[PDB]
Amino acid sequence: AGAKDIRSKIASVQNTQKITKAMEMVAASKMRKSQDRMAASRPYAETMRKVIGHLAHGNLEYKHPYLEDRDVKRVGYLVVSTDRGLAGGLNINLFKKLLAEMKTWTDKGVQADLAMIGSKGVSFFNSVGGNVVAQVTGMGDNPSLSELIGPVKVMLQAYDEGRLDKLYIVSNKFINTMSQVPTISQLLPLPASDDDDLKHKSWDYLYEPDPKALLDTLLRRYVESQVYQGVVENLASEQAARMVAMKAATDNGGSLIKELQLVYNKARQASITQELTEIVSGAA
Amino acid sequence: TMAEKFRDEGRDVLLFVDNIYRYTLAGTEVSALLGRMPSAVGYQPTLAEEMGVLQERITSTKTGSITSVQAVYVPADDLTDPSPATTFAHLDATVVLSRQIASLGIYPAVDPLDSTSRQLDPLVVGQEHYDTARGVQSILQRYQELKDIIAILGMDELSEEDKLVVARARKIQRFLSQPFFVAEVFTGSPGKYVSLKDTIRGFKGIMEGEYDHLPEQAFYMVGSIEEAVEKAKKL
Amino acid sequence: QLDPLVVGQEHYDTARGVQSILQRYQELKDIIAILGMDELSEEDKLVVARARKIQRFLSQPFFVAEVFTGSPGKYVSLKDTIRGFKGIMEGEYDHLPEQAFYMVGSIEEAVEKAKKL
Amino acid sequence: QLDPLVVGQEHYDTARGVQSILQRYQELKDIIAILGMDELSEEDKLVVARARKIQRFLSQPFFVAEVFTGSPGKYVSLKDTIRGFKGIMEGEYDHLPEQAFYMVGSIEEAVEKAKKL
Amino acid sequence: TYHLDVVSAEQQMFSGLVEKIQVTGSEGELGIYPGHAPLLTAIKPGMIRIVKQHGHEEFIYLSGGILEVQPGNVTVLADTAIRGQDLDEARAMEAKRKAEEHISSSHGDVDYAQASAELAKAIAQLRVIELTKKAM
Amino acid sequence: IIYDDLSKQAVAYRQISLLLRRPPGREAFPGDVFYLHSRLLERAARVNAEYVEAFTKGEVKGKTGSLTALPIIETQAGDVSAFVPTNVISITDGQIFLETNLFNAGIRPAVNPGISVSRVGGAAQTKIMKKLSGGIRTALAQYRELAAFSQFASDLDDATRKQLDHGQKVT
Amino acid sequence: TNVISITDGQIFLETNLFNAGIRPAVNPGISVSRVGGAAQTKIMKKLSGGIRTALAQYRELAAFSQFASDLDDATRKQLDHGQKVT
């Protein structure tokens, strides 16, 4: 205490407030960039889904394993998590939503198999005791598709090899700069997208060389694409959560400078009085 | 005492004290010269009486009245220091002038959010004036944070009722400017003296969407509001 | 009188564990104040929850405060409190809400008050 | 007295270069803490290594501290001081380990120490 | 002319109206003129030629992908990196290794590193809440 | 006129005052340290032609006199809010605040804009300088905070990337 | 401020360490002894040299204890050795 300590604490809280304001501004600019990179990725998956629909359940059909259900003996999860702290409640809401449903599933005897994006989920599930088989980390704000080919190659290889029966991607969904929501969604077997081809009486493709070898690659690329989309939305959601958390922190610091200054002024006045009284009453 | 003489003639007087804190400090200097013991923060032992015996002669009376406008300096930015705390016991109103409001080219630069009075009660000023003032105050202090959301996320994020609050707040903030007679030789425009009732009309208007249809620069430096329309006309 | 040789090892150990948790909670109050609570670890959200339970459970209704709150006073023997604080510190009551501990006597009155929420 | 006209541009530039190296290394300690060493640039990893070597080379064994540590003292002229720090900053002694500079004395003894190591 | 779209999973590489293109198909080289009947094929890594309307020719490089031609529209769903079988299995094996051997790599966001470290130092042992008498 | 340290005159006055047993005031400075610097600096004035003419008894008539003063004050650890600095800041017509963080960093003279100001302002400034220099001070007072925010932000918006480097040229 | 100036050392006992469990509550970062190693058996003098440095590095890093989940693993080991020696 004493004036000269409290003034130093006021100075350091003011410094903290500068830092949190800077982090807010940075996070907001990165949020805008990431939600541009988010919309730039729609066209590819949008058109590939129409191709898959016309090819799989159009005027005729071919039948891939990925298209038709089978009894679920054990399940896979692709878990998307941030690489950086200060995101607020983002990661733990998601991980608890996950754990509740992995519990609900293992209440029916089925096992779970985990693959991790981002290192926060890695550190978490490697301590809760999850079964993690493939991971990628350190993508930061530079998510790239080639770095994702691995952990999804694992899950697909295990799916058509028979060791999985269902595959989910768990991630946040960026609705608004002010709200983000965790969601666990299916991506194998392929969900129905209302792709009805009744306008496409009109034609069928020329296939070079054959339609089944094409359909295989189409489905694999589509899964990779949707995992990438999930990663990018999780990134923009991280950025928005960090922006709002740092807004909160800056207000919390500003509303605490005001307390420290009352305490400092009380101490200043007390010191002046105690000194001047000692002088005047020590004289004579 | 010169002001008190004018009052005895039955007039209304206005007494300016260019800095009351220096009156306090001269009292302290003299107190120290006379050898009296130091009180709370070095201030004279008789502080709250030397202040009261000045501030108590400034009152209305069945014959006349003295109003007082007193510039005040608060030491160490501390409204607890004995001198600010002793003065504020006597002040009815309080107007604070802001560098920022002036930066926007608005004069007089009276900050409407921190300026206060204790004549603002439905009991004393009436319900209409009171709630008109509270209305413009709430408008301004919401705009205060919308203007931060704008600065961080850009205008396009704001809801579309807020895009209208941010249009009414700007018109309110303009309409608080005025052309003084004394200000001509800066602003050229002639001076205006606005009767209270007219200010209540103008802000009751702007607050509730009336005059939504005319541009914000028709309010700037106009005076009454029934001249805001006749400045929009030629805009 | 707070010595292993005077109050026995178990009483002393419980008192010191309580001091240590409450102190560790004091050291987080500034991080929680500035950054908010969601920045804490999974092992330091648990410390905070246990400390905030120990704080309530230190409260008690007094036979002389009935004048102020009506709630009947409780008398809590020593064994019955060095059992309850051991209980809270070792997480065996983690499934209860904080308000289950406010102004109760022994720990069974808290496990009972939780049923009423 | 530390301005060019009174100490000369040689001494002045050596001292200012040392100060700036250590300032940059202070900028970088807290990136090393979070992101680890392997993430620095190839330019910055050399600033780190030279800053650490300079930070070592400032130490010296005193003739009177011999009673505290036994190691014999050293007297170092100003000429050798400048010729040493200039040499470190210009990348001339990158071949030596850090501890070849710790408590060495003159720079010509850092190589003789590194040969023992 | 017809509308050509070259899009990857990540970004849009080309758009706009074209007069013709020549692509290297998996089966053989190809060439698409307007009105070309529907077709679907893979394409090999290599260049693609476009003639933007009014004969402005230019060459783009594609790592692979899939070509879909509809009568008046065509789109090339390109890939970001060479996609083979043994290329992807190396990635799969590395991703499998990194999960058992807990090699948690670091991100590279140096701005967050500096801001977080300054924020950690500044808030250290402030003892503010003991100093001001907030209850909490 | 230049007073090398008005913060050492106050110390000598405090001494000579205590040794006479006169009652002290805040921070043990004598009761009236303010009336010490006030009555000193209020001599620095510009005085008009009527006063010079009367004083000099008609010998010189066309002129006005002046005595400008630059008092110097020393602050402990940048604390502008100490008892003797906040006194003298309340008497003069401005201040040039020389900042140590600029001086060590090599910005010399270390004039700190924003915190330092001249209250007579452009009335004193020569016309060409009043024209050219009008924009500088706020430009620098803003660049100096933009250069703070620029620590945590890479990838700056190229709109501010120009302001930064321009402010850096001028600095 | 007098008896700190008169003496050849200081042992600072701090209540924020005492409460947290560290008894005796000696604070090694602000305590001093000017006789130093001359007042030690040579085995203790040999061994305590590394303890001083372990605790000094721990004090320089400890600001990060509340962010340890993101720290590089090369410093995490120093930050944990400091805790074990404390």
What are the domain boundaries of chain C? 2-117
Helix axes B196-207, B162-175, angle to 10 degrees: 160
Q: Is G38 an interface residue toward D (CB < 8 Å)? A: yes
Compute φ and ψ for C76, nearest 5 degrees.
Answer: -120, 115
> Do E40 and E14 touch, CB atoms closer than 8 A?
no
Identify which of F134, F107, F140, F139 has the alpha carbon closest to the alpha carbon of residue F122. F134
H/E segment holding residue E127: none
Backbone angles phi, psi at A53, to 5 degrees: -65, -50
The domain C2-117: what is its CATH number? 1.10.1140.10
Contact B202, B135 (CB under 8 A): no
* One domain, residues E78 and E113: no
Structural domain range at position A190:
60-205
From chain A residues 166-205, the ones with a CB under 8 A of any chain C CB are none
How far CA A93 is from CA of A97, C48, F116, in Å, comes to: 6, 19, 50
Q: Determine the Cα–Cα distance for residues F10 and B142; give it in Å rounded to an integer.
A: 49
**A133 and A263 part of one domain:** no
The number of angstroms, rounded, from the C-alpha of B126 to the middle of its chain's C-alpha atoms is 19
Provide the total of helices (H) and of strands (E) in chain D, helices listed first.
5, 0
Cα dist from E65 to A5, E43, E82, G5, G54, whole Å: 66, 6, 9, 80, 57
Spatial distance between the Cα atoms of A53 and A63, rounded to a whole number of angstroms: 12
Distance (Å) from the C-alpha of residue B42 to the closest C-alpha of chain F? 6
Query: Do E25 and E66 belong to one domain?
Result: yes
Cβ–Cβ of G70/D32 closer than 8 Å? no
Token digits of residue A191: 């969900």
Sort out which chain F residues have CB atoms less than 8 A from B38's CB and list them: 23, 25
- Hey, which residues of G are catalytic here? 34
Q: Is A252 on the interface with C (CB under 8 A)?
A: yes
Cβ–Cβ contacts within 10 Å for residue G79, how many? 19
Q: How many domains does chain A have?
A: 2
Which helix (H) or strand (E) covers residue E66, if one does? strand E66-69
What is the Cα–Cα distance from D29 to D37, expressed in whole angstroms?
10
- With tokens 């203007």, the residue in question is B147
**CB contact (8 A) between residue A272 and residue B80:** no
Q: Is any Cβ of chain B less than 8 angstroms from the Cβ of A280?
A: yes
Q: Determine, for residues G38 and D37 on separate chains, whether the beta-carbon distance falls below 8 Å.
A: no
Cβ E49 vs Cβ E21: under 8 Å: yes
For the record, the structure tokens of B128 come out as 């209409």
Facing residue for D39 by CB, picked from E108, E118, E121: E108
**Same domain for A200 and A68:** yes
Residue E35: which domain range?
A: 1-87
Residues of F labelled catalytic: 119
**Same domain, residue pair A31 and A102:** no
Query: Scanning every residue of chain F, which has its alpha carbon at the shortest distance from the alpha carbon of B22?
Result: F34
| Residue F24 dihedral angles phi and psi, to the nearest 5° | -90, 180
Q: Does E35 touch chain A (CB under 8 A)?
A: no
Whether the CB-CB separation of B149 and A247 falls below 8 Å is answered with no
Q: Work out the minimum CA distance from C39 to partner chain A, whole angstroms.
A: 6
Q: How many D/E residue pairs have CB atoms within 8 Å?
A: 22
Which residue of chain A comes nearest to G68, CA vs CA? A85
Nearest partner of C82 among C13, C26, C5, C35, judged by Cα: C13
Residue F153 contacts E, CB cutoff 8 Å? yes
Distance CA E1, CA E50 (A): 12
As a whole number of angstroms, the distance between CA G9 and CA G35 comes to 8
Best CA proximity match to A91, nearest among A171, A187, A12: A171
Same domain, E54 and E94: no
Chain A stretch 172-201, residues whose beta carbon is closer than 8 A to a beta carbon of chain E: none
**Contact between G64 and E106 using a beta-carbon 8 Å cutoff:** no
Other C-beta atoms closer than 10 Å to the C-beta of B155 total 12
Map residue E81 onto helix, strand or coil. coil
Residue A131: phi, psi to the nearest 5?
A: -95, 100
Q: What is the resolution of this structure in A?
A: 3.2
Q: Does A138 lie in the same domain as A239?
A: no
The answer to whether the peptide bond before residue F109 is cis (omega within 30 degrees of 0) is: yes
Distance in angstroms (rounded) separating the CA atoms of residues C70 and C73:
9
For residue B69, the SS3 value is strand
Ramachandran sector of residue A92 (left: φ over 0; alpha: ψ -120 to 50; beta: rest): alpha
Q: Which residue has the tokens 């359940």?
A: A57
Q: Is A153 exposed, middle or buried (0-12, 13-18, 19+ CB in 10 A)?
A: buried
Question: Where is F166: in which H helix or E strand?
Answer: helix F158-170
A183 within 8 A of A171, measured Cβ to Cβ: yes
Q: Is residue D31 within 8 Å of residue D41, measured between CB atoms?
A: no
Q: What is the CATH number of the domain that holds A92?
A: 3.40.1380.10
Pairing assessment for the beta strands F2-3 and F70-71 based on DSSP bridges: parallel
Q: Which residue has the tokens 């510009």?
A: F46
3-state secondary structure of A37: helix
Q: Which residues of F touch E110 (CB under 8 A)?
A: 154
Beta pairing class for E66-69 and F46-47? unpaired
Structure tokens at D71: 């190691």
Do E15 and E71 belong together in one domain? yes
Residue C39 contacts A, CB cutoff 8 Å: yes
Cα–Cα nearest to A167, from A158, A176, A175: A158
Calpha distance G3→G12 (Å, rounded): 13
Would an 8 Å CB–CB cutoff place A276 in contact with chain E? no
Which H, E and C letters describe D8-56, residue by residue? HHHHHHHHHHHHHHHHHHHHHHHHHHHHCHHHCCHHHHHHHHHHHHHHH
Bridge partners of residue A77, in order along the sequence: A114, A168
DSSP state of B157: G
Last residue of a domain, one of A147, A176, A205: A205
What's the number of domains chain E is made of? 2
C20–G69: do the CB atoms touch at under 8 Å? Answer: no
Rounded to a whole number of angstroms, the distance between the first and last alpha carbons of chain C is 38
Chain C residues whose CB is inside 8 A of the A256 CB are 33-34
Q: Does C35 touch chain A (CB under 8 A)?
A: yes
Last residue of a domain, one of A185, A205, A225: A205
Q: Which of A221, A227, A219 is nearest to A53 (CA)?
A: A219
CA dihedral in degrees (D3, D9, D10, D14; nearest 10)?
50
The strand pair at F117-118 and F94-95 is best described as antiparallel
Q: Degrees (nearest 5) of the Cα angle E122, E126, E127? A: 165
Q: How far apart are CA A242 and CA A20, in angstroms?
A: 10
Q: Give the one of B41, B73, B76 whose C-beta lies nearest to F81's C-beta.
A: B76
CB contact under 8 A, F24 and A280: yes
Q: How far from the centroid of its chain's Cα atoms is residue A47's Cα?
A: 25
Q: CB contact, 8 Å: F148 with chain A?
A: yes
Q: What are phi and psi of A185, to 5 degrees?
A: -130, 155
| Residue B59: burial class (beta carbons within 10 Å; 0-12, 13-18, 19+) | exposed
Chain A partners within 8 Å of B41 (Cβ) = 269, 272-273
| Best residue of E110, E112, E118, E119 to probe chain D, by most D CBs closer than 10 Å | E110
**Closest to C12 measured CA to CA, from C65, C86, C75:** C86
- Considering only the C-alpha atoms of chain G, give the largest distance between any 2 of them, rounded to a whole number of Å: 46
Residues of E with CB under 8 A from a CB of D: 106-108, 110, 113-114, 116-118, 121
* Residues of chain F contacting residue A29, judged by C-beta atoms under 8 Å apart: 153, 155, 157
CA distance A76 to B183: 77
- B and G touch per CB criterion (3+ pairs under 8 A): no
DSSP state of E5: E
CB pairs under 8 A between E and F: 8
Give the single-character DSSP code of B170: H
Which residues are registered as beta bridge partners of A113?
A76
Cβ E91 vs Cβ E39: under 8 Å: no
Among candidates A14, A86, A24, A240, which has minimal Cα distance to C35? A86
- Which residues in chain D are contacts of G71 at CB distance < 8 A? 33-34
What single-letter amino acid sits at E6?
Answer: V
Angle between helices G73-85 and G42-61 (to 10 degrees): 130
- What kind of fold does domain B120-235 have according to CATH? 1.10.1140
Q: Widest CA span of chain A, in angstroms?
A: 114
Minimal Cα–Cα distance from E132 to chain A, Å? 6
CA distances (Å), origin B73, targets A266, A271, B24, B29, B70: 19, 22, 11, 17, 10
SS (H, E, C) chain G: CCHHHHCCEECCECHHHHHHCCCCCECCCCCEECCHHHHCCHHHHHHHHHHHHHHHHHHHHHHHHHHHHHCCHHHHHHHHHHHHHC
Query: Token pair of F77, please?
Result: 């650890």
Q: List, as ranges, residues 2-61 from A with C-beta within 8 Å of B.
A: 24-25, 28
Residue pair A215/A62 in contact (Cβ under 8 Å)? The answer is yes
Contacts of B73 in chain F (CB under 8 A): 90
Interface check for F25 against chain A (CB to CB < 8 A): the answer is yes
